[PDB]
Design a protein around this ligand. Structure first.
Ligand SMILES: [Cu+2]
Ligand SMILES: [Cu+2]
Lengths: 173, 173
């Protein structure tokens, strides 16, 4: 659960930290065998190479199983100035395994195969900070930050994928 | 397949009738279970209201799943004078169902839910003519015409959406 809090998104309705969708793993495999995050991430790594995976954005964009574009955030909201310290900040700590990435228009500016282990300490209470994030490519006149996170979890023995997506319009830098 | 031929477009590379993207339907539905172009249009109409649809431009602009702005046409191409007869002419007949629209800068000057039935006869050989089109709003010093068409078709039983986009720079009246 969670959303990018800085820079600050607008909301189609109200603020929520919920996932866009929660679905069965879209690639057949031994997901349910894993007792913990290490196993899930290993399965993801192998099965993604079996399924022509590139990145989370290429996986989700254009496929309605992953739910609506931009999730609960509003791409048409008033654009905000990005942070000046080369970061983005999450609304909470990252407590699920799985890959995440930040895009500024068509440029991927941050990516990790396991955002949980890279940007927080795995607890909810320590706020996750994404870094480095270079906003310098943001077109004058403005650009769209997009966050994508595919959380992998085994929920009482049954593995699910959750898709988290934010769109956050920025002013040019 | 096709492009607005009058007024005359310029091309990033070479003239092409092709679609910008071909994607699965972006709204989950009974596309494949319906019959004929009429079934595609009735599904589109009903799912439109489920998915907050306004118009084709609003669907496509700012969403990379619908591919690059202006498609294969060049917005930095040669400015051309608009037709004097209150029409735009396509490069061929229109042989796929679905909505299309013409814009002059931020003004929508023509929209139809099914360009196939409104502007041609369903065959490639009867040149489609869009009408009525009023070019009188074109700023002195120029405007940009934009054409948007979301084609709906079944390809060996599997429904796809295709995006066609043109931009054509016009001289001012
Ligand atoms: Cu969660
Ligand atoms: Cu075609």
């Amino acid at each position: 659960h969670g959303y990018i809090a800085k820079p600050e998104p607008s909301w189609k309705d109200k603020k929520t930290n919920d996932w866009v969708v929660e679905i069965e793993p879209q690639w057949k495999g031994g997901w349910d065998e894993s007792k913990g995050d290490e196993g899930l991430l290993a399965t993801f790594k192998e099965l993604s190479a079996a399924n022509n995976y590139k990145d989370v954005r290429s996986l989700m964009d254009g496929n309605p199983v992953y739910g609506e574009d931009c999730g609960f955030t509003d791409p048409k909201g008033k654009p905000v100035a990005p942070p000046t310290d080369g970061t983005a900040t999450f609304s909470r700590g990252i407590v699920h395994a799985g890959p995440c990435e930040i895009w500024l228009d068509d440029k991927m500016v941050l990516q990790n195969d396991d955002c949980q282990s890279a940007y927080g300490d795995g607890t909810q209470e320590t706020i996750a900070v994404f870094k480095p994030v270079d906003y310098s490519s943001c077109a004058s006149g403005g650009c769209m930050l997009r966050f994508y996170w595919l959380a992998l979890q085994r929920l009482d023995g049954k593995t699910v994928w959750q898709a988290y997506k934010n769109c956050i319009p920025l002013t040019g830098p």
